[PDB]
C-alpha cells in the first residue's frame, strides 16, 4: 500500500556524469562512448546580452576545456554544435557506458532527474513533463547538464539535459538531439512560460490509485462525458482528456468509470484544498498510469 513519487535507481547513470569547464563557466556533461554532451552556454562569454553561439564556437580553443570524471581528466579532440548542446569528442571511451537510446518526452510523461553539481550526482527525483514543457524541479546554479532518463529493460533512455530556470521552480531542458523542450531559447533574454495546466489524465490515474488504496470521500455520484469535460478543462487550468482506453483496467478493478472521475475532478476543483487525498493535494498530476500500476501491483 502507499503511493510515492519515486525515481528509478540511478547507479547506471551516475558513472556517466562529468564536469565540463570552459573559462569561468562550469557545468555538467553526459559522457557516453567517446563523446560528452553538454549545454552550449558553457562556451558563452556574457550573462546578459543575446549570445551568438556560432561566433562563440569560432573563437573556441580546445585546450581551454577541462573535462573530468572524478579526478580523471579527458582530452578534448573536437567540438560540434548540436542544437542547444555541444557534442564534445574526447580521447577516452567511457567503459561504464550503459546500453542507451535517446527519446523526446511528451507532456504528461514521467522521467527521472539526476541532479548534478561539479560533475557529480547529488540527488535523484522523479518528475513529469508539463503541458508548458517545463518540469517542477529543484535546480540551482551549477545544475545545467543534469540528465533526465528512464530505464526500460536494462536500456537507459536519455530524454533531458537541464538548461535553464524560467521562474521559481519552473525548469527547462533540451532533449539529447539539442531541441529545447517547449521551444524556449537558451538566451538570457526575457521570456515567460506558457500557461501551466494540470495534466488531467495523470489526475485520473492518481484518483484511481486513491480508490485502490481506500480513499473514496471525494468520489462524485455524478457523471460527465469526456467531450463536455474537455470544454470545461481548457477554461479551468486542466488539459483535455484524449486517452481513456488506458483506464479500463482501473475501471474494472474499482467499478468506477472515467466519467464519474471527471465529475469528481470538477467538484474537487471547487472546494479545492478542503481535504487531502492519500496525503496529497486532491488534484495531483505527477503520477502516470504506468507509475500507479507499477506501485500497486508490480506490473
Amino acid at each position: 500500500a502507499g503511493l510515492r513519487k519515486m525515481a528509478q535507481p540511478s547507479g547506471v547513470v551516475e558513472k556517466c556524469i562529468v564536469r565540463v569547464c570552459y573559462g569561468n563557466m562550469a557545468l555538467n556533461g553526459l559522457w557516453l562512448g567517446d563523446t560528452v554532451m553538454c549545454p552550449r552556454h558553457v562556451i558563452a562569454s556574457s550573462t546578459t546580452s543575446t549570445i551568438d553561439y556560432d561566433y562563440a564556437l569560432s573563437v573556441l580553443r580546445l585546450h581551454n576545456f577541462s573535462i573530468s570524471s572524478g579526478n580523471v581528466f579527458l582530452g578534448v579532440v573536437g567540438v560540434t554544435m548540436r542544437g542547444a548542446l555541444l557534442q564534445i569528442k574526447v580521447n577516452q571511451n567511457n567503459v561504464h557506458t550503459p546500453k542507451y537510446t535517446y527519446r523526446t518526452v511528451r507532456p504528461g510523461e514521467s522521467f527521472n532527474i539526476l541532479a548534478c553539481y561539479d560533475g557529480a550526482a547529488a540527488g535523484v527525483y522523479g518528475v513529469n513533463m508539463r503541458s508548458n514543457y517545463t518540469i517542477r524541479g529543484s535546480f540551482i546554479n551549477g545544475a545545467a547538464g543534469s540528465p533526465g532518463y528512464n530505464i526500460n529493460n536494462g536500456t537507459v533512455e536519455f530524454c533531458y539535459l537541464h538548461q535553464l530556470e524560467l521562474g521559481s521552480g519552473c525548469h527547462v531542458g533540451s532533449d539529447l538531439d539539442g531541441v529545447m523542450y517547449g521551444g524556449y531559447e537558451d538566451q538570457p533574454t526575457l521570456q515567460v512560460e506558457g500557461a501551466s495546466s494540470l495534466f488531467t489524465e495523470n489526475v485520473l490515474a492518481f484518483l484511481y490509485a486513491a480508490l485502490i488504496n481506500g480513499s473514496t470521500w471525494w468520489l462524485s455520484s455524478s457523471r460527465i462525458a469526456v467531450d463536455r469535460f474537455n470544454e470545461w478543462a481548457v477554461h479551468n487550468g486542466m488539459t483535455t482528456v484524449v486517452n481513456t482506453d488506458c483506464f479500463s483496467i482501473f475501471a474494472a478493478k474499482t467499478g468506477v468509470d472515467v466519467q464519474r472521475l471527471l465529475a469528481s475532478i470538477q467538484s474537487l476543483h471547487k472546494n479545492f484544498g478542503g481535504k487531502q487525498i492519500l496525503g496529497y493535494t486532491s488534484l495531483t498530476d505527477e503520477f502516470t498510469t504506468g507509475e500507479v500500476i507499477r506501485q500497486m501491483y508490480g506490473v
Binding site: 545545467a144 538548461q163 535553464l164 524556449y184 538566451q187
Partner: peptide, 5 residues
C-alpha cells in the same frame, strides 16, 4: 528573466 543554470 531566464537564468541559464
Amino acid at each position: 528573466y531566464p537564468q541559464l543554470q
